[PDB]
Design a protein around this ligand. Structure first.
Ligand SMILES: [Mg+2]
Ligand SMILES: [Mg+2]
Ligand SMILES: [Mg+2]
Ligand SMILES: [Mg+2]
Ligand SMILES: [Mg+2]
Ligand SMILES: [Mg+2]
Ligand SMILES: [Mg+2]
Ligand SMILES: [Mg+2]
Ligand SMILES: [Mg+2]
Ligand SMILES: [Mg+2]
Ligand SMILES: [Mg+2]
Ligand SMILES: [Mg+2]
Ligand SMILES: [Mg+2]
Ligand SMILES: [Mg+2]
Ligand SMILES: [Zn+2]
Lengths: 146, 120, 71, 50, 177
RNA sequence: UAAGUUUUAAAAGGCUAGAUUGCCUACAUUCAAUAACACCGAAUGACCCCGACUUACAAAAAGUUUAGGACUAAAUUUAUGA
RNA sequence: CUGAGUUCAGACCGUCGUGAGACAGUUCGGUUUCUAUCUUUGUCAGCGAAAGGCUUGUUUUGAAACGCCUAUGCACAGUUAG
RNA sequence: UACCGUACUGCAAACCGACUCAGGUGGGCUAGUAUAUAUACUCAGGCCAUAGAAUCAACCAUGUUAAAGGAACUCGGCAAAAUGCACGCGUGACCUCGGAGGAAGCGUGGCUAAAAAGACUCAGCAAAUAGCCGACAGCGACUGUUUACCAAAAACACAGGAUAGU
């Protein structure tokens, strides 16, 4: 619970200052809002890397201390994107990879059409609703309703 | 340990890159070891006067098995090599090539102590 | 790999000597309940003994101890 | 190939081969039934029931 | 075919080694949850050796010991018991935390059966011996332990009076931070 | 374990039976179900086994230790300098 | 242990034959079963009991143990067999 | 708006094999890493009953590793071992011009990097799955078929052609 609270405070401090904000100032920014929290830089780095691995913040190079940015000793700049991303990379690079994958999907479908097969695999439509999901919806509606 | 029908790289400029041991001179019926003379057959030539397919005499100078010494130390070589010999117990090669020519030898092989790049 | 004749009663008895069991020369007997077992084995009620009356152990007083029961 | 399992059961084939009506359809099948009767068999055909 | 008994090593117990270690972990967890379990002699002897290793690891009380026991010991209700009740119970015992009593043979296969239980608990079957035996300073053993480099190694309460003068101090509490 | 290391004389060396001679407080249970560990070992005046501690100058087989098992006794030690 | 060759069943080439076929003429391919009763042999083990008389050398309240020769057991075991 | 089926089993201890038999038995439905119904781990679900218990026999079966050699073994490299994968280069004769051919042979791969780069590891197709290659001949054009139970082949068939009859 404390780790959840500390990560939320690290995100809010990165959110209030919309500037690339490396580990040093995010540690100082979370500490300077009320030694209340974040006793060490290592704990703040562990929280920020976990937030980056869950696609809540991202990283960028640090000028004058680049040290090859994939080396884990490299200081990273944190930007704090507003919503949790569905993917991890730069959105322009993700869009380029999606276009390449979409063209590969068209090519595989065309090759499957020259052979005696369907373009895309045809699968039977299934039923996912049940008594448990209906009753779970009723419990959820009453829970928010109170 | 050099068994019969093995292969080894003759190192000198006598004209044989490789040879097959086809027999042992002494009553040593198991393996050959450094300092022993054996009958070898040249399988592949260097293109020069010793053509492929001759049956000459060779002394093994180094092996990939440990060569044990009396004090308790042993010498390990990363190659199994030999040097050709004549019918007078002398190498036909002008010099044992330094490409694989370092050994421990003082028994009557003083002629082989000048052909090698360095001993020991 | 096959018997050529039929084994006689005398030869069969001689061959079957390995099958017989040796008698045991010691037994541990409980004076109360009359139970019988080896001297290295518990044969009281915790083991199988429906005849045990507890008189086999004649003294067991241990009241005091102190610890943290984990709940 | 392991043998022994020549009998592959089927009710349609059993009734269609050794039933009453294929026995009655031909004359020599009717004398087969007649000598089954003369022997005294309790089950006349493979498909008889009551 | 490797020699395990006759050349001090672990028993094979008719099992592959991964099955063998998993079965011993299950049995040590069961041994500390219910303090007396009954099994065949070979599993009983192997359980006794494994119990000594696991109980000493719990007696260390360190974070690495907790991490190692977390994989070794399954229940988690009893990981707490090993690190707290068992560790305080045998804090000064130099090994031998378990006894073995033979109990005859079992009906299904006539295998020899042994009772394996933790010593020094209410409900044990033989009185324990004290782990330490306070020495007479007027005997030969104490003088041998003075001329030779041996510690006193006396019986002790859980918190001796040598920490009483630190804990009594009101300036050594830090308020609980 | 060998590919390693020793030894392979006249007669040497081994196996089985044994004249004799000597001795005798010897019913044979436990320490783990395949002692082959152990009879050229132990069973509490017991380190026999097991555990614990230490050793990189053993990448681990030795040293301390009666904690546990080989039960057992008192009017001078719940007990060996094990 | 193999079945490489000497027994087949398939096929081809050559010889002979009217032909079914034959060839110890050449080829390619083509089921090796058996859990040891007792006779040997290697090795590991079990069974093959004794107490005889002591007129007991002694004692009274020929019976009881004591003292003897050897009987088993155990140990070392011929200038001792095989 | 009647009549018949509705239990249980159905890759199996309930069917066909004398058996609670390692054999044979048709169709359909399906989650994630992930990407193919292949492969490794797992979801839903199911299972750990039909001899058990320890231990170091020899030997047998099935495998792992092995120093120096390496077909020297053997009727015969039989059996094992070895290549085994996606992106690049490349790439022989002979030939019915289609093929041979994935010829042969050599680089490049995991991990971190909103990213010009690097870390260390003995090892980065890191665990599981996915051709040994080249040459000289003989026979049969080819894919197929053949003695259920010792022979799958050069034997049979084949498209085509010739002959004879109609
Ligand atoms: Mg089949
Ligand atoms: Mg039948
Ligand atoms: Mg085995
Ligand atoms: Mg495994
Ligand atoms: Mg004890
Ligand atoms: Mg099946
Ligand atoms: Mg059958
Ligand atoms: Mg079946
Ligand atoms: Mg699985
Ligand atoms: Mg079972
Ligand atoms: Mg090698
Ligand atoms: Mg792989
Ligand atoms: Mg094909
Ligand atoms: Mg074919
Ligand atoms: Zn009783």
């Amino acid at each position: 619970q404390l780790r959840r609270q500390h990560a939320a405070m690290c995100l809010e401090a990165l959110k209030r200052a919309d500037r690339p904000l490396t580990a040093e100032q995010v540690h100082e920014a979370v500490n300077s809002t009320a030694k209340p929290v974040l006793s060490t830089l290592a704990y703040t780095k562990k929280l920020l890397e976990h937030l980056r691995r869950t696609r809540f913040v991202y990283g960028r190079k640090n000028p004058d201390s680049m040290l090859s940015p994939g080396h884990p000793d490299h200081p990273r700049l944190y930007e704090a994107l507003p919503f949790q991303a569905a993917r991890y990379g730069k959105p322009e690079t993700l869009a380029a990879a999606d276009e390449a994958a979409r063209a590969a999907a068209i090519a595989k479908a065309q090759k499957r059409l020259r052979n005696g097969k369907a373009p895309y695999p045809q699968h039977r439509r299934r039923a996912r609703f049940s008594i448990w999901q209906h009753e779970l919806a009723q419990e959820a509606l009453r829970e928010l309703q109170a | 340990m050099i068994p019969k029908y093995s292969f080894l790289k003759i190192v000198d400029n006598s004209g044989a890159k490789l040879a097959q041991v086809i027999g042992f001179y002494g009553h040593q019926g198991g393996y050959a070891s450094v300092g022993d003379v054996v009958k070898v057959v040249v399988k592949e030539a260097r293109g020069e006067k010793t053509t492929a397919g001759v049956m000459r005499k060779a002394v093994v100078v180094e092996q990939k098995y440990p060569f044990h010494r009396q004090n308790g130390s042993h010498v390990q070589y990363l190659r199994n090599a030999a040097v050709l010999l004549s019918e007078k117990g002398q190498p036909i090669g002008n010099k044992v090539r330094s490409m694989l020519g370092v050994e421990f030898n003082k028994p009557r092989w003083a002629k082989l102590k000048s052909l090698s790049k360095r001993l020991f | 790999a096959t018997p050529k004749k039929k084994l006689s009663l005398h030869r069969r008895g001689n061959r079957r000597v390995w099958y017989w069991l040796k008698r045991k020369t010691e037994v541990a007997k409980c004076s109360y309940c009359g139970a019988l077992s080896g001297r290295n084995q518990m044969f009281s009620g915790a083991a199988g003994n429906s005849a045990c009356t507890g008189q086999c152990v004649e003294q067991a007083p241990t009241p005091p101890a102190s610890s943290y029961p984990a709940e | 190939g392991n043998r022994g399992n020549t009998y592959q059961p089927s009710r349609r084939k059993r009734v269609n081969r050794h039933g009453l009506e294929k026995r009655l359809s031909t004359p020599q099948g009717r004398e087969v039934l007649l000598r089954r009767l003369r022997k005294g068999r309790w089950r006349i055909t493979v498909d008889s029931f009551r | 075919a490797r020699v395990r008994v006759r050349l001090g090593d672990w028993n094979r117990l008719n099992r592959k080694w991964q099955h063998r270690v998993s079965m011993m972990k299950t049995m040590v967890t069961q041994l500390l949850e219910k303090e007396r379990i009954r099994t065949t002699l070979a599993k009983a002897k192997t359980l006794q050796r494994y119990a000594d290793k696991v109980i000493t690891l719990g007696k260390q009380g360190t974070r690495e010991a907790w991490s190692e026991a977390r994989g070794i010991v399954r229940t988690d209700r009893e990981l707490h018991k090993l690190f707290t009740q068992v560790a305080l119970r045998y804090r000064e015992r130099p090994g031998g935390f378990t006894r073995l009593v033979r109990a005859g043979w079992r009906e299904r296969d006539a295998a020899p059966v042994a009772f394996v239980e933790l010593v020094d608990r209410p409900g044990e079957l033989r009185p324990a011996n004290p782990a330490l035996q306070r020495p007479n300073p007027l005997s030969v053993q104490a003088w041998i332990r003075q001329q030779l480099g041996q510690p006193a190694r006396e019986p002790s309460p859980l918190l001796p009076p040598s920490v009483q003068q630190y804990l009594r101090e009101e300036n050594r509490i830090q308020q609980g931070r």
